[PDB]
Structure formats: C-alpha cells, structure tokens
Amino acid sequence: MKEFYLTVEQIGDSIFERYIDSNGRERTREVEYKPSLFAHCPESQATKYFDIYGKPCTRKLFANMRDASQWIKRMEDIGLEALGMDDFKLAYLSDTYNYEIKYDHTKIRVANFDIEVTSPDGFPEPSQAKHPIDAITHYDSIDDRFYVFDLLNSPYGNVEEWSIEIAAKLQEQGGDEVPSEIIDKIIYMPFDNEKELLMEYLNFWQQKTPVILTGWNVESFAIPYVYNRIKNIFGESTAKRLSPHRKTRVKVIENMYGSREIITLFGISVLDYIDLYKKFSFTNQPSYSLDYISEFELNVGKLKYDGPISKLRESNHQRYISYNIIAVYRVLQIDAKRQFINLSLDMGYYAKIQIQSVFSPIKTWDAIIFNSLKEQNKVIPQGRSHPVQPYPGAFVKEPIPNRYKYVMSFDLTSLYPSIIRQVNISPETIAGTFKVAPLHDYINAVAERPSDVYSCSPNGMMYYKDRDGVVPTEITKVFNQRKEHKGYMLAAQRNGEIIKEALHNPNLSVDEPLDVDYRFDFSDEIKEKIKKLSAKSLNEMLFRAQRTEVAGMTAQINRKLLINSLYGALGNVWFRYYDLRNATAITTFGQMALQWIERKVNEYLNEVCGTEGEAFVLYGDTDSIYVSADKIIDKVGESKFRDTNHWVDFLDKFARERMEPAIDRGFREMCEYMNNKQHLMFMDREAIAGPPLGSKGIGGFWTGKKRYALNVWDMEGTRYAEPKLKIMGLETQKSSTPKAVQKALKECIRRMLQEGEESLQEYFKEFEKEFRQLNYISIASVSSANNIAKYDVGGFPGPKCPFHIRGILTYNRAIKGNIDAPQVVEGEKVYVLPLREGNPFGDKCIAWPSGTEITDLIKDDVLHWMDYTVLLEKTFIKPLEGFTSAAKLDYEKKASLFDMF
DNA sequence: TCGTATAAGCAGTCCGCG
DNA sequence: GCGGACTGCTTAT
Ligand SMILES: Nc1ncnc2c1ncn2[C@H]1C[C@H](O)[C@@H](COP(=O)(O)OP(=O)(O)OP(=O)(O)O)O1
Ligand SMILES: [Ca+2]
Ligand SMILES: [Ca+2]
Ligand SMILES: [Ca+2]
Ligand SMILES: [Ca+2]
Ligand SMILES: [Ca+2]
Ligand SMILES: [Ca+2]
Numbered sequence: 001m002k003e004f005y006l007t008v009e010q011i012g013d014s015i016f017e018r019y020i021d022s023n024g025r026e027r028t029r030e031v032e033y034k035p036s037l038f039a040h041c042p043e044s045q046a047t048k049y050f051d052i053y054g055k056p057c058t059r060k061l062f063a064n065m066r067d068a069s070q071w072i073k074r075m076e077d078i079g080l081e082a083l084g085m086d087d088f089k090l091a092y093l094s095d096t097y098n099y100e101i102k103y104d105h106t107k108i109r110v111a112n113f114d115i116e117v118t119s120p121d122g123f124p125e126p127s128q129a130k131h132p133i134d135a136i137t138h139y140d141s142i143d144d145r146f147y148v149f150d151l152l153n154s155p156y157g158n159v160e161e162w163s164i165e166i167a168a169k170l171q172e173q174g175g176d177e178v179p180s181e182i183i184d185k186i187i188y189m190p191f192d193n194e195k196e197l198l199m200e201y202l203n204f205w206q207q208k209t210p211v212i213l214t215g216w217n218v219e220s221f222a223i224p225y226v227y228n229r230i231k232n233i234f235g236e237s238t239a240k241r242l243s244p245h246r247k248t249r250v251k252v253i254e255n256m257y258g259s260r261e262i263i264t265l266f267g268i269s270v271l272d273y274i275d276l277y278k279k280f281s282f283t284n285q286p287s288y289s290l291d292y293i294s295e296f297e298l299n300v301g302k303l304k305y306d307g308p309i310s311k312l313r314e315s316n317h318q319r320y321i322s323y324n325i326i327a328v329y330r331v332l333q334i335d336a337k338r339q340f341i342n343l344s345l346d347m348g349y350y351a352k353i354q355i356q357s358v359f360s361p362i363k364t365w366d367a368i369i370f371n372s373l374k375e376q377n378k379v380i381p382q383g384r385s386h387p388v389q390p391y392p393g394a395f396v397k398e399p400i401p402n403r404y405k406y407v408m409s410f411d412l413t414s415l416y417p418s419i420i421r422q423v424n425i426s427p428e429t430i431a432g433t434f435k436v437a438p439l440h441d442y443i444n445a446v447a448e449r450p451s452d453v454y455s456c457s458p459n460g461m462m463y464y465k466d467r468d469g470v471v472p473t474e475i476t477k478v479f480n481q482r483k484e485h486k487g488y489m490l491a492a493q494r495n496g497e498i499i500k501e502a503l504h505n506p507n508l509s510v511d512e513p514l515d516v517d518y519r520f521d522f523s524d525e526i527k528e529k530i531k532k533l534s535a536k537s538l539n540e541m542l543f544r545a546q547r548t549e550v551a552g553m554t555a556q557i558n559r560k561l562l563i564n565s566l567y568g569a570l571g572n573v574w575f576r577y578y579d580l581r582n583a584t585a586i587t588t589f590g591q592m593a594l595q596w597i598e599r600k601v602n603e604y605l606n607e608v609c610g611t612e613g614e615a616f617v618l619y620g621d622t623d624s625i626y627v628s629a630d631k632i633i634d635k636v637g638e639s640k641f642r643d644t645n646h647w648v649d650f651l652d653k654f655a656r657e658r659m660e661p662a663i664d665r666g667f668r669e670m671c672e673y674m675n676n677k678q679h680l681m682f683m684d685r686e687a688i689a690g691p692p693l694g695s696k697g698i699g700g701f702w703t704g705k706k707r708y709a710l711n712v713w714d715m716e717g718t719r720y721a722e723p724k725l726k727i728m729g730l731e732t733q734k735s736s737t738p739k740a741v742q743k744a745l746k747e748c749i750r751r752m753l754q755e756g757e758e759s760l761q762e763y764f765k766e767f768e769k770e771f772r773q774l775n776y777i778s779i780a781s782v783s784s785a786n787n788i789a790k791y792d793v794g795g796f797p798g799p800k801c802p803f804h805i806r807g808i809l810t811y812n813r814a815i816k817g818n819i820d821a822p823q824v825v826e827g828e829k830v831y832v833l834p835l836r837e838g839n840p841f842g843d844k845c846i847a848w849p850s851g852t853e854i855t856d857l858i859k860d861d862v863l864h865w866m867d868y869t870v871l872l873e874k875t876f877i878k879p880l881e882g883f884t885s886a887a888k889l890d891y892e893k894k895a896s897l898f899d900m901f
Numbered sequence: 902t903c904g905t906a907t908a909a910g911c912a913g914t915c916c917g918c919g
Numbered sequence: 920g921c922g923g924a925c926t927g928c929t930t931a932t
C-alpha cells in the first residue's frame with residue numbers, strides 16, 4: 001500500500017510523525033526536518049521559484065525549524081516579506097506525501113471514550129479533578145471492543161462487580177438492555193482501587209494509542225479530567241503518557257466573554273463529537289446532552305434512572321456501568337448514521353493537514369492552496385495583519401406579504417463558488433479596476449461595458465482571462481466532489497419516495513428487503529419487486545434508503561460548506577489570501593445576477609402572457625427566485641387537470657422547456673456583458689408549490705424577508721408521495737420556539753396551505769382549549785444564556801437585563817445554598833417559562849438548564865405558577881396572527897349575518 | 902460559543918410620544 | 920401601546 005500519516009507534530013526542531021508504512025504497520029518517527037522559506041530576489045538571478053504574481057524568489061534552506069522561525073522575525077524587523085509555508089509541519093506533509101493520499105480507515109485507530117465521576121458537591125471541575133474516576137468505557141475501532149474500567153472501591157462507596165448477564169436483560173426483567181450486538185464485544189475489568197485502574201488505563205492506552213480521539217464532550221470534560229486526575233495522583237510526567245510523544249499543553253480557549261482550558265495532547269487528533277456535530281450536522285438544538293441528541297438522531301429512549309447521578313453508583317452500580325457503556329455506543333451509532341469521522345478523514349487527507357484542523361476552513365484552504373502552488377514551484381505570500389472591516393453581502397427582495405397560490409422557484413447552483421470560477425477571482429488574477437456605475441445600471445444593462453480585455457465584477461474589479469487562478473482551480477475540484485455526493489443523496493431520496501408509494505399497498509407475505517445500492521435510481525426490475533414486498537421489508541428498505549440519503553447529505557453539504565467558506569475566508573483577516581476586493585467582487589456580482597435574472601424572468605413571462613410591468617418574481621434571496629405561476633395555471637384552466645400531479649407535471653415541463661432556456665439566454669448575455677471567463681450561472685427549477693387540486697388550501701405565503709411557507713410537490717426532481725411543507729424562518733423552524741408550539745404552528749400552516757381557512761379555525765379552537773394540559777417542557781421557550789454575571793446585580797436583574805437571563809437569576813435565588821442543584825452553565829442553553837403575578841419566586845419568569853427536568857424542590861411550584869396565558873399569547877398566538885394576516889385569513893371565525901338563525 | 906462570510910427577522914428593555 | 924435605538928439571539932442564505 002501507499003503510506004499515509006496518522007498524526008504530525010512540531011516539537012522544537014523535530015517533527016514527530018505517526019504513520020502507516022507500506023506494509024500497513026503503524027510506526028512513529030522523529031525527523032530533524034529542514035524547512036525552506038523564500039525571499040524575493042533580483043530579476044537577473046535565475047531561479048525556478050516564483051511568487052503567485054510571477055516575481056522571482058530564492059529558496060532559503062534552514063539548518064532547523066527554530067532558525068526559520070527566527071528568520072521570519074528578523075524579516076519583520078527589517079520590513080521585508082518572508083514568503084512560504086510558515087507552519088512547518090504542513091510543509092513536512094507536503095514533502096513527505098507528494099501525491100494524492102489514499103488512506104485505509106481500518107488501519108486508523110479511532111478511540112471513543114467516556115468517563116464517570118461521582119461528586120457530592122456539584123459539578124466535578126476537570127481543572128480540579130478532586131474526585132475519583134470510577135468508570136471508563138473506551139471503545140477501540142481496531143479491536144472492535146468496548147474496554148470497561150470499573151472502580152469497585154471508592155471513598156464514595158464500595159460496590160459489587162457489574163454483571164454482563166443482567167446488563168443484557170430487558171428492563172422488564174430488571175436488566176439494562178445493553179444492545180445484544182455489543183454484549184460479545186465487552187471486555188470488563190473491575191478494580192480494587194483507583195490507582196491500579198488508572199495505571200492499567202495508561203498501559204492499555206500505550207498499547208492501543210488513539211489516533212483519532214472522540215466521544216461526547218471529551219475535549220471539554222473527559223480528557224482534562226483524566227489528565228488532571230492522573231496529574232494530581234502520580235505527577236505530570238505520568239499524565240503526559242496520554243501523549244505518545246510525552247508532550248502536552250494546557251491550551252486556553254478564548255471567546256468573547258471569558259475563557260476555558262483544554263489539554264492539547266501532541267500526537268493525538270481529538271475530534272470531540274459534540275464539536276463535529278455542531279459544525280457538520282446543520283441543526284440547532286435546544287439541548288446538547290447526549291440523551292437529547294441520541295433521541296433526536298436515533299429515536300432511542302432516554303437513559304432511565306432514579307435519584308441524582310451523584311447517588312447512582314452507590315444506589316445502582318449495575319445501571320451506572322451499563323449506562324456508561326451505552327453512552328459510548330450511542331456516539332458510535334450517531335457516527336454510523338452521520339459519518340462525520342469519515343468526513344473529517346476525507347477532508348483532512350485531501351488537504352494534507354492535521355485531522356483536527358477540519359474545524360478550520362482557513363487552515364484547510366491554506367494547506368490545499370499551498371500544496372497546489374508547490375506543485376508548480378510557486379511560493380505562497382506571507383500572512384499579513386489586517387483590521388476587521390464590514391463589507392456588503394447578498395441581495396434579498398422585499399416581498400409583498402400575501403398568500404401565493406401557485407409558486408415555482410428557481411435556484412443558482414453553488415452560486416458563490418460558481419461566481420469565483422466564472423469571473424476567475426483569485427489573489428493572483430487581479431488585473432486592475434474599472435470605473436463603476438450604480439449597480440442598478442448593470443442590472444438594467446444601460447451601464448457601459450466594464451472591459452473588452454478582462455473578466456469583470458460590478459464592484460469595479462477586473463480579472464485575467466488567460467489562465468485559471470489557484471482559487472477557481474481548487475474550488476472546482478471540491479465542487480466536483482460535492483456534485484457526485486449530492487447526486488447520490490437525491491437518488492436515495494427519490495428511491496425513498498418509490499418505497500413510500502409502494503407502502504400504500506403492502507403485500508401479505510414473509511420476505512426479505514432487496515439487496516440494493518440506494519445511491520442509484522431503482523431500475524425497472526427493482527421497482528417491480530418492491531411492488532410485491534411486505535410492509536416489514538418495505539420499511540427496512542425505507543430505513544436503509546433514508547440512511548443512504550443522510551450519508552450523501554453529510555458528504556455533499558459539508559463539501560458545500562467548505563467551498564462557501566473559501567469565499568468567506570476571503571473576508572477573514574487571518575486568511576493568507578484575505579482580500580476585501582475579492583470578497584466584495586463575489587457578493588456584488590451575486591446581487592447583480594439575482595436582480596438581472598429577476599428582470600429577465602419578468603420580461604419573459606410578461607411576453608408569453610402578453611402584459612407589461614407585471615411582477616411575476618415575487619421574492620428572491622441571494623441566489624434564488626420565486627415565480628408566481630397563477631397566470632400559467634389559469635391560461636389552461638384548473639378544470640383541464642386530472643389531479644394535482646397533472647398540473648405539477650405541466651409546470652415541471654413549462655419550467656424545463658420554456659423558462660430554463662430563457663433563463664440560460666439571459667445569463668449568457670450577462671456573462672458577455674461582464675466579459676467573464678466561463679459561463680457558470682446555471683439556474684434550475686427548484687420547487688413546484690400549490691394547494692391540492694380541488695381544495696381550499698392557499699398553497700403558500702410570505703410574511704416578510706426570510707419568512708415563508710410553501711406546500712411543495714416537487715423539489716429538485718423529487719416527486720413526493722405526500723406534499724411536503726417547505727417552511728423557512730417561521731417559528732416552526734426556530735430552536736427557541738417550544739416543541740409543542742412548533743408542532744401546533746406547523747399544523748396550522750399545513751391546514752392553511754392544504755385545506756384552507758375553516759380547517760385552520762377548527763384546529764386553532766382546539767389547541768387553545770387543550771394547550772394547558774401540555775407537558776411544561778414541551779411549552780418552555782429556549783435560549784442560549786450569555787453574560788449572566790454582567791446582568792447579575794446582587795442576585796437581581798441589572799439594567800437592560802434580558803428576559804431569559806432574568807429567568808436564570810430567579811432560578812439561582814430559588815436554589816440558593818444548594819450546591820447539589822444543577823447550575824446554569826454560562827454560554828449554554830436554558831428552558832424559560834413565564835410566571836404569574838404574585839408567585840413565590842418573586843419574578844415574572846424562570847429558566848433552568850435545557851434538556852433537563854427542573855430540580856424537584858421547585859418543580860411543583862413552577863408547574864403551579866406557570867403563566868399559560870402569557871405562554872400561549874407569546875409563542876403561539878402572536879406568530880399565528882403574523883402568519884394569518886400575511887395570508888389574509890382569520891384564525892377565529894368572524895361573526896356573520898347567518899348568526900340570526 | 903475556537904473553528905468562513907453578510908442579511909435580516911423577532912423578543913425584549915428603555916423610554917419617548919403632548 | 921407602538922416605534923426606534925439598542926442588545927441578544929437566531930435564522931436564511
Ligand atoms: N455557510 C455559508 N458560508 C458562507 N457563505 C454562504 C453560506 N451559506 C450560503 N452562503 C452564500 C454562498 C452560497 O453560494 C449562496 C447561496 O447558498 P445556498 O442557497 O445555500 O446554496 P448554493 O447555491 O451555495 O449551493 P446549492 O444551491 O448548489 O446547494 O449564499
Ligand atoms: Ca455520564
Ligand atoms: Ca438546486
Ligand atoms: Ca443555490
Ligand atoms: Ca404491493
Ligand atoms: Ca438558495
Ligand atoms: Ca438548466
């Protein structure tokens with residue numbers, strides 16, 4: 001096999017590299033890597049190294065890395081550019097792995113771990129580590145085993161061994177239902193004392209040293225706790241055995257308001273799954289507890305136990321260990337689904353970076369562009385200091401708030417990256433500027449042509465047309481990878497719909513799901529077989545189709561994230577290629593393109609309908625337009641259509657055969673006007689929306705910018721078995737809105753779009769009547785809680801105190817003196833409830849940590865004093881009134897003359 | 902919330918608005 | 920009570 005790195009570190013003048021050798025063996029080497037850096041040199045001198053602008057460079061080879069660093073400093077003191085890759089370990093990887101890396105994941109040791117710590121006096125601070133570690137479950141991907149380290153004897157209780165037999169049993173037999181598929185994979189090691197537990201853990205760690213280290217909150221909790229606990233018990237040198245090169249750093253993470261400490265373990269790549277989830281999942285969650293996320297991702301039941309977690313070990317050690325094991329498995333189950341580790345390895349090896357650098361697109365892109373340029377003996381510029389400066393972004397059209405019955409939307413593919421490619425926007429392709437007319441003049445094609453030589457953006461920038469810049473070249477590669485995976489995702493989605501249809505008529509028979517690749521559109525043969533399957537097989541196939549879709553989603557959406565972040569990096573001061581001229585060139589062209597095509601689509605439709613000045617485009621945001629199709633439907637007449645799918649097909653065909661060609665012509669003209677290198681403004685039909693044929697549904701509505709709902713029949717070539725609500729921006733989509741309220745509002749919107757006003761009034765009346773029965777958690781609002789101390793004046797609300805922060809202050813007073821009560825963590829989320837006048841809490845709201853039941857001593861009081869009226873008016877009625885007035889509908893039946901009978 | 906970007910919505914405080 | 924000025928938070932893109 002081809003060799004690949006696992007981890008790389010710089011330690012003084014040595015590179016420490018763990019890698020897989022040609023035989024598949026894990027090795028470690030120390031290399032006295034001599035880095036090269038570059039300086040500009042005279043034109044006369046003959047060399048093979050040039051900077052990105054074609055200026056000649058001389059290579060300076062340093063006796064060691066510290067010399068290179070010292071040189072960079074002296075170059076700053078002199079006031080001269082020190083060119084080249086200043087992160088020497090990236091240069092080492094580039095030198096050592098000068099080919100496309102092909103990695104074998106089966107050879108990479110992925111460790112998933114979780115620890116337990118009993119604590120009476122509240123949260124066990126990792127930096128203190130004052131309490132014993134009494135359980136560690138460590139899953140190893142190479143052995144495929146859960147190693148369980150169990151403390152039998154503690155100052156907080158002596159306990160009996162965990163029993164694998166009870167662990168396996170159903171909860172109905174008094175067991176813990178540890179999943180039967182892992183029971184055989186558990187290696188249980190009980191211990192008489194904490195020191196031997198920890199010593200053995202370290203010896204184990206040494207034998208099976210993680211390359212990738214993950215888990216849930218491992219970076220913020222488990223790793224620092226284990227490290228500091230071993231430190232406190234044995235000394236630093238022993239704690240540093242967690243690093244394979246015996247080097248660690250206490251790393252301070254700085255944010256806006258305060259800071260925390262993590263431990264950097266050299267020669268390990270820590271990918272904390274919470275952090276992976278937050279970056280790559282594209283969710284915003286009310287809580288980030290593992291139970292909550294597991295429930296959301298996997299539909300698994302919450303881990304059940306009585307009493308505080310501080311008493312679970314001594315009261316039920318059996319359950320204590322089993323839940324520790326299960327918590328580790330849950331992260332693996334989430335990864336089997338979401339596949340973020342796979343993604344991180346793909347991105348990391350592609351860029352030739354430390355795998356943990358996938359969190360940073362700036363680092364990812366710096367390394368991709370460096371390797372790309374190195375290939376041509378080109379030399380990257382030095383990073384520079386820049387002041388943070390605002391710059392303009394996308395255009396968003398102000399919609400007329402209204403119902404909109406028939407809507408067809410159109411969307412530009414991967415817009416910002418396409419702009420970069422079309423215009424040829426790169427640090428080294430800048431050709432100069434041209435005198436800019438107001439944007440409106442370009443949109444209406446009355447402005448003078450910017451250039452007859454260069455490719456232009458309406459911000460005034462001109463770019464070379466002779467060759468592609470390194471940014472277009474490298475963004476195109478990842479764009480093309482994204483395209484492949486999105487193709488797989490949509491095929492899986494279309495395949496899902498095929499299964500949902502067949503599920504309407506399941507066969508009464510025993511059979512097995514078809515062995516198929518859901519990444520490809522089902523053939524005719526597969527379609528026939530599906531029509532003959534049982535519901536049990538169809539459901540398993542639907543589950544599998546949907547897992548394939550999710551896998552594709554991860555792969556495609558995060559490649560899209562990476563390429564859109566390359567645009568965003570052009571507007572970040574820490575990026576090597578930071579240039580506000582390039583960032584603005586991109587955003588300004590985007591603005592032009594959307595308004596240009598709006599004008600075009602309007603002109604085209606006014607023509608085919610034989611009108612003038614009619615607004616067919618009702619809305620647009622950044623890269624997408626929404627076309628009112630009412631007139632198109634009316635031109636054939638609703639009565640001519642057999643069913644919903646009939647007009648959906650007709651619109652599909654109108655969009656494909658008539659509008660897209662007009663849209664294409666309009667963008668090709670704009671490409672010529674701007675003299676761009678390559679036409680890449682590809683705008684395709686996205687959504688087809690409208691009410692069910694023969695219903696009183698309104699189809700869709702907008703309330704304002706970034707706030708709308710559509711009843712969608714077809715999305716990007718996926719014809720739904722059942723219409724799908726596409727709701728953007730409205731309270732149903734906000735994590736701050738109560739769960740039960742999101743669900744109720746969503747159903748109000750469903751009724752509006754699919755059934756009409758009367759149906760809506762039916763549902764509202766019932767919800768209003770019954771809502772006081774809803775679980776308090778389901779009707780709690782959610783908010784992040786920043787700067788709690790700032791607004792805390794002697795335990796009371798300071799000036800301008802935010803409503804949710806007031807809740808927390810109320811809560812804090814209610815749990816005063818109690819170090820066992822859950823504390824609200826700064827920067828984390830809270831549930832928030834209003835409180836009726838004259839409650840014992842002494843204020844108008846209370847807040848407690850999200851994902852949790854509120855502590856038992858105040859629960860009854862909260863439940864008794866909860867202000868249901870305020871709750872209803874704020875989270876439900878106000879948003880609903882917003883929706884309905886926008887749509888010219890009433891949620892309550894207005895009195896009429898018929899009330900006389 | 903360490904980790905690419907801007908546009909823009911709504912809740913809530915504070916206080917004006919004769 | 921509603922709006923603007925502003926903070927806080929959260930979406931859409
Ligand atoms: N997370 C982000 N970071 C930076 N820029 C973004 C981000 N999301 C969107 N944008 C900008 C760049 C995008 O090209 C543009 C429109 O985005 P969006 O409608 O999500 O899809 P897209 O056109 O980028 O890809 P596609 O439509 O192919 O899925 O807005
Ligand atoms: Ca736990
Ligand atoms: Ca699209
Ligand atoms: Ca798009
Ligand atoms: Ca059938
Ligand atoms: Ca879009
Ligand atoms: Ca097309």
Ligand SMILES: [Ca+2]
Pocket residue numbers: 857858859860861
């Ligand atoms: Ca009480």
